[PDB]
Amino acid sequence: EHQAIAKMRTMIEGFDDISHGGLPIGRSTLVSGTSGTGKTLFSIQFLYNGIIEFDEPGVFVTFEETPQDIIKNARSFGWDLAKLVDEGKLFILDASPDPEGQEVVGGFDLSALIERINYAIQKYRARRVSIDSVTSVFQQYDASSVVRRELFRLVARLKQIGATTVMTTERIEEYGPIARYGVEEFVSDNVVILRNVLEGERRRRTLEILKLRGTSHMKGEYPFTITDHGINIFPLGAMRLTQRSSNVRVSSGVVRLDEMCGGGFFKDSIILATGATGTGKTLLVSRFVENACANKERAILFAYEESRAQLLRNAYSWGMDFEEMERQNLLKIVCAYPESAGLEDHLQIIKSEINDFKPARIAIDSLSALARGVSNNAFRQFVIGVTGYAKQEEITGLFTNTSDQFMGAHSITDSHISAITDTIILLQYVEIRGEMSRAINVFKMRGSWHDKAIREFMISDKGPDIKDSFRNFERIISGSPTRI
Amino acid sequence: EHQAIAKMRTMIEGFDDISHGGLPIGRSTLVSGTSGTGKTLFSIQFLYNGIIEFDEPGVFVTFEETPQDIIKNARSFGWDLAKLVDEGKLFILDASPDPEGQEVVGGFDLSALIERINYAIQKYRARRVSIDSVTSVFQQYDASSVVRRELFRLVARLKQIGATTVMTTERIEEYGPIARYGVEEFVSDNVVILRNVLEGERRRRTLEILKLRGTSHMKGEYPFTITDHGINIFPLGAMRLTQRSSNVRVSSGVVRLDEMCGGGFFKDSIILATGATGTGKTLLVSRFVENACANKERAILFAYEESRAQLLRNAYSWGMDFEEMERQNLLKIVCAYPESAGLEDHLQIIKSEINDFKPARIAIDSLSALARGVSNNAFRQFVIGVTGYAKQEEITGLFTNTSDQFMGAHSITDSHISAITDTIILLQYVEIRGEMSRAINVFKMRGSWHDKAIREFMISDKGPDIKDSFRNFERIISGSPTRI
Amino acid sequence: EHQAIAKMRTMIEGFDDISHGGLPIGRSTLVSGTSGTGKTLFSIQFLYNGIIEFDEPGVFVTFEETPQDIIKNARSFGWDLAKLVDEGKLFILDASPDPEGQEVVGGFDLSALIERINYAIQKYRARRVSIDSVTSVFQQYDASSVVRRELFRLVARLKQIGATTVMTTERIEEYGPIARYGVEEFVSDNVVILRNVLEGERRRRTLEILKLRGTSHMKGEYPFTITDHGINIFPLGAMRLTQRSSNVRVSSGVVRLDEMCGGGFFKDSIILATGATGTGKTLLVSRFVENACANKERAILFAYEESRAQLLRNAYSWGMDFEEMERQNLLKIVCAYPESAGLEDHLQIIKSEINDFKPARIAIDSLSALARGVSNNAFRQFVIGVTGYAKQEEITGLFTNTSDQFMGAHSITDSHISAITDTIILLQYVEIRGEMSRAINVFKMRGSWHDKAIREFMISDKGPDIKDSFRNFERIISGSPTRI
Ligand SMILES: Nc1ncnc2c1ncn2[C@@H]1O[C@H](COP(=O)(O)OP(=O)(O)OP(=O)(O)O)[C@@H](O)[C@H]1O
Ligand SMILES: Nc1ncnc2c1ncn2[C@@H]1O[C@H](COP(=O)(O)OP(=O)(O)OP(=O)(O)O)[C@@H](O)[C@H]1O
Ligand SMILES: Nc1ncnc2c1ncn2[C@@H]1O[C@H](COP(=O)(O)OP(=O)(O)OP(=O)(O)O)[C@@H](O)[C@H]1O
Ligand SMILES: Nc1ncnc2c1ncn2[C@@H]1O[C@H](COP(=O)(O)OP(=O)(O)OP(=O)(O)O)[C@@H](O)[C@H]1O
Ligand SMILES: Nc1ncnc2c1ncn2[C@@H]1O[C@H](COP(=O)(O)OP(=O)(O)OP(=O)(O)O)[C@@H](O)[C@H]1O
Ligand SMILES: Nc1ncnc2c1ncn2[C@@H]1O[C@H](COP(=O)(O)OP(=O)(O)OP(=O)(O)O)[C@@H](O)[C@H]1O
Ligand SMILES: [Mg+2]
Ligand SMILES: [Mg+2]
Ligand SMILES: [Mg+2]
Ligand SMILES: [Mg+2]
Ligand SMILES: [Mg+2]
Ligand SMILES: [Mg+2]
Ligand SMILES: [Mg+2]
Ligand SMILES: [Mg+2]
Ligand SMILES: [Mg+2]
Ligand SMILES: [Mg+2]
């Protein structure tokens, strides 16, 4: 690796990519954020992984949380630090005050502390050190100048010993100064900022490596989630554009359509189905799913508009029995409101379910539903994310999109995802003789030829029946054609 | 223990969903909010439910409000604490100052206080403790650093006694620091934020669990309302997408309509009637209510546009007698201006009326009326609300929508709810031979077949007469056809 | 007293509707706001209304203004305080400092005053007290901490005393902290905020009951005014949708029009005349107002576009004499530019005059003129106000609206009021053979059946003459027809 600085791996999903390999060894990383951002979690996970993956003893210095609590809280992610303390791989160095205390101590303690820590490190042959809430130590009565010396002194001796350190710091504003005293930022070798931005009553956690003296790294903010497994990062912009592509074809579930697509959809492709309410995107999805099961293949249907029940009532009405699909353990239906969590979550949920089910086909009914509230920029990042995972996973995926206006829609999508998709399937109403008839169309395909006709189609208990084109009409797209 | 972190239930409607079980046992939780946000209410309702639901004795430490008052006010919600005091189930520890104050009390009190609290905890075998305004205590002449210690101490000692406590703190900026000294947030293991956000002369009460060291919890803000039954929170993002579905139909009040819908509306469905003013949605709504009492069933009509008297005058003129409807106790008309309150409130009023009247059918005349002033995201949240609640209750609901523009409308809804609804009914004006005639169209029906025609219809004393389509016109969807 | 919180009416118009009863008895209510928000006025009008409505003596404690001025000023609203002081009903407890003095007199008088006050309370059998500018007292040299103690002592004492008080406080920002020391907020049992919101060089006073401990109240801000009869608040959200409705008919003033509305306008209804400039709204208004005089009924015409003198001319050129109308005291013209006062002030002026002339009919020439500048929500809130009052007052109302664009207007009103109105009349230009001809059209009626034809009409010295429809045309609504 062409980087001048030797790094250690956090083994924290996504972090090592963001930091181009992990935390510089022998240095210290300031990890700061507002309340409940995941600082303690980040540092504990840092020592944990260190012990489990590389047998690297760790020293956890705590200034506010009690050693029992640090061990009790860790059980939230099924981590047993008590077992590690007994094995002598983890040492929690208690430096929290006692509920009786006095006044004055943040100085010689800084010298006593260093000596304490050098003892633990030497005794336990420690390779990693995280210092949780150093902020609270000189949070006794100090100014910025006194803080710079004490921190620098701490960091400096830690570097002499050779310990790779992680120091947590608190902030009050999500975007203003990096840390409380506006001094930590510059004493540290590297700086990580954990945010938890509000905006729209939802909460989005992001991680940012602001600086790493010596090497490069990914810049900006990256979304993450805390789970029963700790921190989980998606470097959405680290996603390389090297997806495998094959000319393999797969049916859509509708024979006539497959012809229209010049032999069916591609396996390695993303399909977009757009049209106004009532056109039949939801239907098309059903048929897309069923076909994956009719060939003994798994498929997931992430529904964001219809209940699990309704999805069954309507599917049966179109024939195709979903009950059996789930029993045979070939079709897995999800279902959840887009307002039940921000995009990151939705993205992460979609991924796990893709891992705990090895789907060959996936269907997200209504991206345009996920687009509610969120800003366009946030949505497209979401669309690149789903769309990208699916691609690198040889997982054919059909996406749905309802257009904000029936008849007259000038754009295939109000979100402008169009270029992100390989094959687009357009549905639309046609006002013919006082009636609302449907018309299906294969607008585009990248590897195939595809039919260029705008066929009309009817929906029956049997399903979608693709008929013929309105040859004798003008302005079909307008929605209100003229008979010529 | 060798497991995660046990939680205690607060029985506060909604909160135990948001917290994934309730408050972390053996720990304290900082509940802070600006003036009048519900901090005290929350703390009394935490003790109260702990007594009345599990018989867990409670201690209430008060620092400003007098014990007599605290009991006086609880009456507001039909809470008799004085009774619980006598039964030794609840103990109100008066720590409030006397009208003849004295200097320096930042230590004697700290341990003298715990001494008392502990004494009380042991005496009444209290399981719950809630302290009101710990803020006021060091509001004598202290700085953040001194504040941090005192809380660290108060919090630490309570832990030792093993008390599951609720601590109240006051703010000053709805989105400024979480608490008065920007320190409390980091000392507490758990933090709850209660907000009374202004915005457009209206106030919206929300609740957020910023963090609970040790476990998971729903993130973000959640709207709640303080009623005669205390705090009521609506985790609008917790409602699952597991609504029950069936092929059971229900008439509309319009037989020709029922025909166009393939045999009537589904009971388990959401219908939406859109069109310009004058087309006839308020009509379709009455014709809906009636049909619910002719089959001796109970229905509620939430009107926000026309008064109660008018709804009657116009209903009689269409025939159907609303008078009898009410007497027979099968029909209940509410009526109230959308400006009379905020969305959160309206949503609740809708629900409580559904509970006290066991409705079969429900209709909201003009969702678009409720969309006045309020942002779009707030509205959809409302629509998802009243919509899913109905869906899961087996309630057949009809929702009215008045598109901003007569003729030319390119979208069924300006708000864009058309995708959350099951069946869409479209009314529109059609300029014919210098005349303004109507038309009706069953735009979409998820489970049924429904008529695809745009039938013209007249309105008389008898009601709505759905005639034929204009099979000899072009561009009818535009309002100004072209005879051919 | 083991009952809910009992309140005491302030008799301040509107306040008792918002506060669900009035100020809670025996408790102190904080009332703060920026300079000149009506603070003093409030407390004072609180002690007055008491003396004159329930003969409850009152004690007024002033710390800055002199008793002479407090009385001299009250004269601004026709309140002879001087008299009430004599009749021992009101006692003004001067507590203002003199041009000379000393210092180091902190809580010294705070204790002495709580006596002087108790004195006058018993001495005059006082039930209501009001302390104007408590803030100015510790505005000598205190910190937030010293302020919280002094206020708690005072409030506590007055509470023991059993007095129902109103304490005045000053703010510096309309939307920042509640009171100067951000401490009063929490010390008070009730907090009311008076705001004098600037915004576009226009000032809008609003009052808000932030909290009332132990009881319910209306949330949010509320516009109010300061007139010669004291504070006047309009609970526009409190107005119920319980308006009386009848099938009585009345005449538009245009026979042919009445026929079209199927027998005329309903007495209990609101008519909206919509059209581009020149169409003729001011004509219908003229005609509508004249008709109420022909039947010796009183009617008011609130003109916001044309002057008194001009209305006369143009109306005499149409026949109808407005001169006699006024002599016969059957017609009352108003006239004022919308720019001569905020919506709040207009709405009131509209109401006051309706009370000083018992109108049976009402005409507002150009709602769209009142819509100038003001935001859309602030407008609808004015429409609903005027619309409602008229409605519950059995007064027939005709409101005019000029659409922003002539020909092609795709919406009746730009402000969207159309769903707030019972009867919609639509005037429009029709380009036929290179000439601009008119057309009248009864868009909708909630009771009657009305005509659906779009009839062209012409204006002469006789007034409006409704002719025929354009049966042989196409795209009339558009304004640029096509003959078939
Ligand atoms: N199993 C879990 N799943 C999801 N979230 C969790 C889980 N366990 C803890 N959390 C969340 O992790 C956060 C706890 O923060 P954490 O313990 O990482 O330290 P911190 O927020 O950085 O600092 P502080 O000590 O000031 O709270 C909380 O927001 C909490 O809800
Ligand atoms: N049994 C059936 N027989 C005939 N037509 C049906 C039947 N079921 C559904 N349909 C038709 O299909 C439409 C249902 O739309 P569908 O579920 O396919 O998804 P969509 O229109 O793409 O998206 P959305 O959920 O927004 O409606 C109805 O509007 C209706 O015309
Ligand atoms: N029965 C009730 N129904 C509706 N709202 C009520 C009722 N009783 C009280 N309220 C409202 O509840 C709020 C009272 O807040 P509460 O006393 O619980 O705590 P706080 O204001 O956050 O803190 P503190 O009381 O110590 O100042 C006020 O907004 C009040 O008007
Ligand atoms: N007795 C009647 N006979 C014939 N037509 C009537 C009668 N009453 C009302 N109408 C017609 O019905 C329409 C009334 O509309 P309705 O009250 O049904 O609700 P809407 O148009 O959907 O919404 P809103 O009128 O509140 O804006 C009028 O436009 C009118 O043409
Ligand atoms: N007759 C009146 N008509 C219209 N406005 C009036 C009349 N009398 C007084 N006002 C207005 O009323 C307000 C008087 O405010 P007031 O003295 O009651 O309280 P304040 O200014 O809020 O606080 P403080 O007087 O303690 O400084 C001013 O804005 C003034 O212009
Ligand atoms: N004596 C008259 N003879 C013929 N037509 C007249 C006469 N007076 C006015 N008109 C016509 O009536 C129109 C006057 O409009 P009017 O006063 O009725 O109000 P408006 O058109 O509704 O609103 P606005 O004030 O914006 O013009 C003129 O544009 C003109 O065509
Ligand atoms: Mg934190
Ligand atoms: Mg921490
Ligand atoms: Mg769908
Ligand atoms: Mg309280
Ligand atoms: Mg309407
Ligand atoms: Mg209506
Ligand atoms: Mg849709
Ligand atoms: Mg002033
Ligand atoms: Mg308070
Ligand atoms: Mg005019």
Side-chain angles (χ1 to χ4, degrees), chain B residues 76 140 170 180 202 436 483, chain C residues 148 182 214 221 452 471:
Chain B
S76 182
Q140 291 188 302
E170 40 205 60
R180 203 177 256 293
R202 288 310 90 203
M436 289 289 92
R483 327 177 196 177
Chain C
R148 189 153 198 158
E221 287 182 291
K452 324 297 171 183
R471 185 197 313 87

Side-chain angles (χ1 to χ4, degrees), chain A residues 275-279 281-282 305 365-366 368-369 400-403, chain B residues 417-421 424 444 446:
Chain A
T277 31
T279 40
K281 300 96 68 189
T282 310
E305 305 175 301
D365 206 332
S366 188
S368 65
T400 280
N401 172 78
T402 285
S403 67
Chain B
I417 323 170
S418 27
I420 302 171
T421 204
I424 307 175
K444 80 161 185 174
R446 286 174 172 161

Side-chain angles (χ1 to χ4, degrees), chain C residues 47-339:
Chain C
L47 292 189
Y48 194 97
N49 289 52
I51 292 179
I52 305 306
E53 283 301 316
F54 323 84
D55 192 283
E56 293 169 41
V59 185
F60 187 80
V61 195
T62 181
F63 288 103
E64 220 155 58
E65 287 193 72
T66 199
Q68 350 302 295
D69 296 305
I70 301 175
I71 307 174
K72 183 58 169 170
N73 295 325
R75 294 198 187 297
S76 177
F77 321 82
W79 308 137
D80 179 20
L81 300 186
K83 179 174 178 181
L84 294 175
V85 170
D86 289 321
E87 308 192 336
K89 292 297 176 187
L90 161 69
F91 173 50
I92 289 171
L93 172 43
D94 178 308
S96 81
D98 285 296
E100 282 295 301
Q102 54 189 296
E103 272 199 294
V104 188
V105 188
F108 287 68
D109 289 298
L110 195 290
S111 54
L113 186 66
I114 298 175
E115 253 62 66
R116 298 169 54 190
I117 294 175
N118 177 45
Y119 180 66
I121 293 180
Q122 319 176 324
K123 188 186 169 196
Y124 297 79
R125 312 162 205 171
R127 278 263 187 175
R128 305 176 171 201
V129 189
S130 285
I131 307 176
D132 199 10
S133 61
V134 323
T135 300
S136 59
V137 76
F138 19 58
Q139 255 275 304
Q140 301 183 305
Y141 48 51
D142 296 289
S144 58
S145 61
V146 193
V147 176
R148 189 153 198 158
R149 318 172 189 170
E150 307 297 7
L151 281 192
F152 177 62
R153 180 186 292 169
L154 171 58
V155 184
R157 296 293 286 84
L158 296 167
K159 201 168 186 173
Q160 315 176 305
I161 296 177
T164 319
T165 312
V166 159
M167 302 174 65
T168 279
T169 308
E170 35 206 46
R171 304 172 76 227
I172 304 178
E173 214 306 279
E174 221 63 65
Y175 287 101
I178 295 177
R180 253 174 196 296
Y181 300 100
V183 163
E184 301 86 337
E185 291 96 308
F186 312 94
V187 183
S188 302
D189 293 283
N190 316 294
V191 201
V192 170
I193 300 179
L194 298 183
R195 285 179 246 250
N196 196 200
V197 175
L198 185 42
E199 143 236 306
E201 316 195 316
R202 291 307 77 186
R203 289 285 180 176
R204 180 190 180 175
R205 355 199 55 139
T206 70
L207 167 157
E208 172 181 28
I209 302 197
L210 222 202
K211 75 169 185 180
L212 283 185
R213 272 177 174 156
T215 47
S216 67
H217 62 74
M218 291 176 94
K219 285 72 180 177
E221 287 182 291
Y222 285 90
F224 82 83
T225 320
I226 290 185
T227 70
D228 300 310
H229 293 309
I231 294 165
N232 202 72
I233 318 170
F234 301 82
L236 305 181
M239 187 181 75
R240 294 186 180 183
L241 189 57
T242 314
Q243 333 289 66
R244 285 172 297 171
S245 180
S246 66
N247 279 303
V248 178
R249 293 278 185 146
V250 204
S251 177
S252 59
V254 164
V255 180
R256 190 65 185 91
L257 214 198
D258 292 299
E259 288 175 57
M260 301 171 84
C261 290
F265 290 164
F266 280 93
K267 179 203 178 182
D268 295 317
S269 82
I270 284 171
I271 313 85
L272 176 77
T274 314
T277 40
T279 47
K281 290 98 61 198
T282 309
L283 176 59
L284 299 182
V285 166
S286 289
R287 208 74 158 191
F288 183 78
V289 172
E290 175 222 48
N291 181 295
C293 292
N295 289 296
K296 301 175 179 174
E297 305 177 305
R298 298 197 170 188
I300 304 185
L301 170 56
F302 300 85
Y304 295 89
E305 308 186 319
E306 306 169 61
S307 72
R308 319 189 173 192
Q310 195 173 299
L311 277 180
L312 287 175
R313 186 193 60 182
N314 309 326
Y316 192 72
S317 293
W318 282 319
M320 45 210 291
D321 176 308
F322 272 4
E323 275 291 58
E324 201 56 54
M325 309 280 86
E326 305 186 75
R327 299 167 190 166
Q328 299 184 305
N329 261 62
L330 282 173
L331 170 280
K332 185 171 183 180
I333 303 174
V334 184
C335 297
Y337 285 77
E339 292 65 50

